[PDB]
Design a protein around this ligand. Structure first.
Ligand SMILES: Nc1nc2c(ncn2[C@H]2C[C@H](O)[C@@H](COP(=O)(O)OP(=O)(O)OP(=O)(O)O)O2)c(=O)[nH]1
Ligand SMILES: [Mg+2]
Ligand SMILES: [Mg+2]
Length: 373
DNA sequence: AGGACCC
DNA sequence: GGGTCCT
């Protein structure tokens, strides 16, 4: 099992789609989904009118005064539809990895091979692509890698069709030989379109990026380190001294990020299955005095309990997260956790009680249940 | 507990 | 306003 066919599915303006489906009157109006002072996402009509993702509400409403806004602080419906998407994809092939609420990877390698064994040495030359070919690259029908990726594009088109027919949702897909490249290529044509990457255009796709932060896997901190070292482009990263990179980022981060800079990524698509943790949050800048705010911890709990119940499995740990404030230097939240007594596993008041103590041990209040069994 | 990453 | 896995 060497060469892979991977699809990355990435839905369009996910919370906005869900809001437009719920309230048809919002369809073909420019629409922003708001959380506190942020317009976290907006539909493609708003993006034509200036509105950007994670743009603050003011900038957004003076870029576009008629922008309609709906509150998206409660994730219940987005989370529900998100699992519907994953389950539908799992029906195509069972190893589906989630990334956030609206991206999924599927390893289609077995499915592609089974479809190939089913065509004769006649219709093999009838194989055609579905959707865009990255960089308008010519297909070579005698290249077995090209043929597999095209069958991969046909499977992806069937996935996007089923999503739309069964769930009312549109999205993009990217088909490529690994997860890094499938995820880079899925965003090439948006919204609601798909693209496949043939191997000869891999360097073109990688060099299309304008900074190494654009590479999935390289974040805020790593990008700052590389900068400090004079590394700005993908090519700077590709040509940089492996030794020097090793003894600066650790052998782990360094060998992996350098491979990514070439388009190389051996990481497997992992079956996400059910979630590992369940949390709810609330934000209020300045607002929590450190006493008159327990009632908040009680709401978070009431709502979580219903979710964790419905799941069918139970958590064996609970955690309280907080954020403090005086100025905005970089990062730092705070957590205390402890196990959940097993009497209480099998509800409110004793949980309120455990939490009010983890509080006393210690803007933001969140509760997180984890260590599910 | 907290770090880095992700959407 | 959520999530993942590693140290
Ligand atoms: N609060 C918050 N929500 C986010 C953040 N990133 C993503 N989300 C939510 C809003 C999105 O609708 C959903 C999926 O994230 P994506 O990056 O795919 O953006 P979205 O689908 O809206 O846009 P797209 O059409 O994919 O460009 O997750 C973030 O940094 N903060
Ligand atoms: Mg995305
Ligand atoms: Mg999306």
């Amino acid at each position: 099992a060497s060469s892979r066919v991977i699809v990355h599915v990435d839905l369009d303006c996910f919370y906005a789609q869900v809001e437009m489906i719920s309230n048809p009157e919002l369809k073909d109006k420019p629409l922003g989904v708001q959380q506190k002072y942020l317009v976290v996402t907006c539909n493609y009509e708003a993006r034509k009118l200036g509105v950007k993702k994670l743009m603050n509400v003011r900038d957004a409403k003076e870029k576009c005064p008629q922008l309609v806004l709906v509150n998206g602080e409660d994730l219940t419906r987005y989370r529900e539809m998100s699992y519907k998407v994953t389950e539908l994809l799992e029906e195509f092939s069972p190893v589906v990895e989630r990334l956030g609420f609206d991206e999924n990877f599927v390893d289609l390698t077995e499915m592609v091979e089974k479809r190939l064994q089913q065509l004769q040495s006649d219709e093999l030359s009838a194989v055609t692509v579905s959707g865009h070919v990255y960089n308008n690259q010519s297909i070579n029908l005698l290249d077995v890698l090209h043929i597999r990726l095209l069958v991969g594009s046909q499977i992806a088109a069937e996935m996007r069709e089923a999503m739309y027919n069964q769930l009312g949702l549109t999205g993009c897909a990217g088909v490529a030989s690994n997860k890094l490249l499938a995820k880079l290529v899925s965003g090439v044509f948006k919204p609601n379109q798909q693209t496949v990457l043939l191997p000869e255009s891999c360097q073109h796709l990688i060099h299309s990026l304008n900074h190494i932060k654009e590479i999935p896997g390289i974040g805020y901190k790593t990008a700052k380190c590389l900068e400090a070292l004079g590394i700005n482009s993908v090519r700077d990263l590709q040509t940089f001294s492996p030794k020097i990179l090793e003894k600066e980022l650790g052998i782990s981060v360094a060998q992996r990020i350098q491979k990514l800079s070439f388009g190389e990524d051996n990481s497997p698509v992992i079956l996400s299955g059910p979630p590992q943790s369940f949390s709810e949050e609330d934000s209020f800048k300045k607002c929590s005095s450190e006493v008159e705010a327990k009632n908040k911890i009680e709401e978070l709990l009431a709502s979580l309990l219903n979710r964790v119940c419905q799941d069918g499995r139970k958590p064996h740990t609970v955690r309280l997260i907080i954020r403090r404030y005086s100025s905005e230097k970089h990062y730092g939240r705070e957590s205390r956790q402890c196990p959940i007594p097993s009497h209480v596993i099998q509800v409110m008041t004793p949980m309120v009680d455990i939490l009010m103590k983890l509080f006393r041990n210690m803007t933001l209040l969140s509760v997180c249940f984890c260590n599910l069994k």
